[PDB]
Ligand binder design. Structure first.
Ligand SMILES: COc1cc(CNC(=O)Cc2ccc(CNc3c4c(nc5cc(Cl)ccc35)C[C@H]3CC(C)=C[C@@H]4C3)cc2)ccc1O
Lengths: 532, 532
């Protein structure tokens, strides 16, 4: 009865799940779209046709077809991110965690996983929503969307492979929530979408896209924003990459109709196996198939829409991690290792910045190098290692997000900015990697509340402060409970630009997060590249 | 007898001078050239034709025709630099202080005054050589040369105004020393030339010029070097400024000879009054009539000569002051005042950068601005003032000199590098201007040994260290006395790049003098301006 819910698409049967020392309801693997299989590959998704009977929704759905990281087999630090379920092109499902007993009209949060737009799963351990739903009395939804070529191949002009269909996948899940969340105790007029990395940029892209704005109330962006350099491409580049994807598979390249037909004949892993051969340069933090600026989902360039205020006016809560770049240097840069301190030589450093700013000309490379090199101590392996990390994280995450937050605040209705700089007491990665890309998700999702996971007492407390900020923001548009005796997270304004740290210590308020480096990244370096 | 000396050109009668609690010999205003007057204006100097009888040499000579600074009339701090004798085109004289009794063969130091190549006199109080001749038992010479258009108007191709005749004035005095200093007790085989500002660049230019290399032994350069941006021009820009000086005074511009004839009819102050009107930009630390890269004095470009090693190989001692730029901001930049602390607004800062890097495009100015702005505190008037100060000093003196120091040390036979950062306890200029362009000369010349000048006991000891450094270096090529247990001024090498502070505290050895900012000024900015 509590577990049996009738939706506009059909009946669904959930399952009772234990959560700490209590229980809540879970609805797992609910379909929201028609499977994008066969001739529906590279397609705009179509709504799930209603079903008769009762949908068994007690088990996680499949994961979408994606690259699988096999660098450290058996290593929990890397495999906690890989698909923990069978992969399939039939993957467009969503999951819901409802408090027990079921609320009447409670706040809804909708998780959007990240992963460079080429990977990601709704079913990972760190995305399990029971702790959040149960602790903050919210209805927690995690959606899914097609990644890699399956969701972002873009042959603009074709209605058959138009691009951005993975973004339409998320839009349609949010439409489902809009149409059905009431039957689970959720209030569709108070829906918060939130995501990390490509999920965070996705969230920002729904803030921008007119066809998405009315499908949610407010937004949380973690280590990602729509203007990121890795987050979108022109139709010309997206076309070039799709045409090049065919050339790698001996496809006929004369018509989109022929190219699309050829690529529809390929097994999923055939596309995945050559997915990276299509990038223009040797690079890190760069991905082949990503959203496109198409004049449709995005009416104009991301920057003109930001200048004109052409976007959803609401409240946003967003932030970054202290060492966003370390994960990428480990995997793609010379001199970095999981098992050493990864002191970086001068020769390696130069190769690093080349691989980090792959679009820059020789003058631009000098500019980056000069801004991050202490020429009293240029052979210092550690300053060179830490410099390269800052290069990667500033260029790709921090400074793109800061440009977004300053532009948005000029028109929005409330900004809250955080800096997550706590290193987990139980990290499995070496100490040089710092506060890693994606390792705040464990605290947002309350995993430190599980005593067997061996977080410290202070980390359980930090994870509860964070969950409550997120939830209170989702409920009210403000992370702070007014009238409460707690330290207050201040609003980010255009003039004072305040933000807080997130960590185990009492709160500190700072101003102008990485202003110096981000003036370089957001104003000087593009002006130098435009000229030259 | 001690004061009567026979030279290859005629007899000279000196005078017996008091110094501290003793006396020495002084020969003032000895002619070394024919008066470059009338039809000889702008021409190469001619050797002074011998005279019969006894030249009265007990009186300072005339000063050369030059701009006279009247900003602060009566103020000792600016008027100590103005001509203290009558001005005249008949100004090619030299002065000699000789210890008493006369030594047999003793080291010779030849002083070359600075002043932007448009001003400067051999006869100023701070250049009075008795203290240095007496305290260090050297024969001390101060020469003179033509400045302004009189010394450096350049119409390459013409033999009537070929350019660089001011440098040639210096060369001829050096030739006279080589020919006569032995009669005053000086060893012509151990002559050290030294000068500040334009005088330091001049010393450097004699190191480069083949026709000068044999006329001296070793060199000291203070707050100036031949590759400074204000220190030379092309033949085209010299001709351009010459033609414009003509246009400014309604001269026939048809031919070099008509133009030269017209200018030779003008009174001296007629030329001076329009001297500034020929500069290409609104600028500070830029001077109209300066040496020319002509192909004869300088065989090729200064950089090629520095690269090929085409220069005199010997020992050099050289350095800079802490705040070279404040004097020029006082006189030519908005917001600076003699009587206030001159906190600089952001608008005046921007106006400063433009006047300071007049040859930069907009990308260059943003580069300078970014490099010297603290964007956590951009409305700090002190930080803005001190930034503008560093921009002027680094771009015009410190970084130009460090490039010379590095290039020269690769081929030279001994470099010694100093950083003079003591601020005199009796300065008449405000604290914000720091250690000023020019104000190390007083310590080099031992003015702190005069009790009436109200220096501190520790400044007299500093001045004595400096005099002994200079004289010892001149005597031996090493500022350090052997087998003394005083701290040793380390040789500057290609790889360790050590230098010393000069102040009242015990000496410390540092490395890489302002290497961060000078990578920008010597390697990045020129590359950016060449690319844009
Ligand atoms: C656009 O900017 C402007 C720039 C100027 C330039 N100002 C001048 O030429 C005036 C001037 C000022 C001073 C001198 C000679 N005096 C000095 C000299 C030196 N340092 C000084 C430091 C101070 Cl604080 C004051 C005077 C010094 C150090 C030596 C180098 C020079 C160039 C001149 C001598 C000797 C000559 C000429 C005038 C008006 C402007 O608007």
């Amino acid at each position: 009865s509590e577990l049996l819910v009738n939706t506009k698409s059909g009946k669904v049967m959930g399952t009772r799940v234990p959560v700490l020392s209590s229980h809540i309801s879970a609805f797992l693997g609910i379909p929201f779209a028609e499977p994008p299989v066969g001739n529906m590959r590279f397609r705009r998704p179509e709504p799930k046709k209603p079903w008769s009977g009762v949908w068994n929704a007690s088990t996680y759905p499949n994961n979408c077809q994606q690259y699988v990281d096999e660098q450290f087999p058996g290593f929990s630090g890397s495999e906690m991110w890989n698909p923990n379920r069978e992969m399939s092109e039939d993957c467009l499902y969503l999951n819901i965690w409802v408090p027990s007993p079921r609320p009447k009209s409670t706040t809804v949060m909708v998780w959007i996983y990240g992963g460079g737009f080429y990977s990601g799963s709704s079913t990972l351990d760190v995305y399990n929503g029971k702790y959040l739903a149960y602790t903050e009395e919210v209805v927690l939804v995690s959606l899914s969307y097609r990644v890699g070529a399956f969701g972002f191949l873009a042959l603009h002009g074709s209605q058959e492979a138009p691009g951005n269909v993975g973004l339409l996948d998320q839009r349609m899940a949010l439409q489902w929530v809009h149409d059905n969340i009431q039957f689970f105790g959720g209030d569709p007029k108070t829906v918060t979408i939130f995501g990390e990395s490509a999920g965070g940029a996705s969230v920002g892209m729904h803030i921008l896209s007119p066809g998405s704005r009315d499908l949610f109330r407010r937004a949380i962006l973690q280590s990602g924003s729509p203007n990121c350099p890795w987050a979108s491409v022109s139709v010309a580049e997206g076309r070039r990459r799709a045409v090049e994807l065919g050339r790698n598979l001996n496809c006929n390249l004369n018509s989109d109709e022929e190219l699309i037909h050829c690529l529809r004949e390929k097994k999923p892993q055939e596309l995945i196996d050559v997915e990276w051969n299509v990038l223009p340069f040797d690079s890190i933090f760069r991905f082949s198939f990503v959203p496109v600026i198409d004049g449709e989902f995005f009416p104009t360039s991301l920057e003109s829409m930001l200048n004109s205020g052409n976007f959803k006016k609401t409240q946003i809560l967003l932030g970054v991690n202290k060492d966003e770049g370390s994960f990428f240097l480990l995997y793609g840069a010379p001199g970095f290792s999981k098992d050493s301190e990864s002191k970086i030589s001068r020769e390696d450093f130069m190769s690093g910045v080349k691989l980090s700013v792959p679009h820059a000309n020789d003058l631009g490379l000098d500019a980056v190098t000069l801004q991050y090199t202490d020429w009293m101590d240029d052979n210092n392996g550690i300053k060179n290692r830490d410099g390269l990390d800052d290069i990667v994280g500033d260029h790709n995450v921090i400074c793109p997000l800061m440009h977004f937050v300053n532009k948005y605040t000029k028109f929005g209705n409330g900004t809250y900015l955080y800096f997550f700089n706590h290193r987990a007491s139980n990290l499995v990665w070496p100490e040089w990697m710092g506060v890693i890309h994606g390792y705040e998700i464990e605290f947002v999702f309350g995993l430190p509340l599980v005593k067997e996971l061996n977080y410290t007492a202070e980390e359980e407390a930090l994870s509860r402060r964070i969950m409550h900020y997120w939830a209170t923001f989702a409920k009210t548009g403000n992370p702070n409970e007014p009238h409460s005796q707690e330290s207050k997270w201040p609003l980010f304004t255009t003039k004072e630009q305040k933000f807080i740290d997130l960590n185990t210590e009492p709160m500190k308020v700072h101003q102008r997060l990485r202003v110096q480096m981000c003036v370089f990244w957001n104003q000087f370096l593009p002006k130098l590249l435009n000229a030259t």
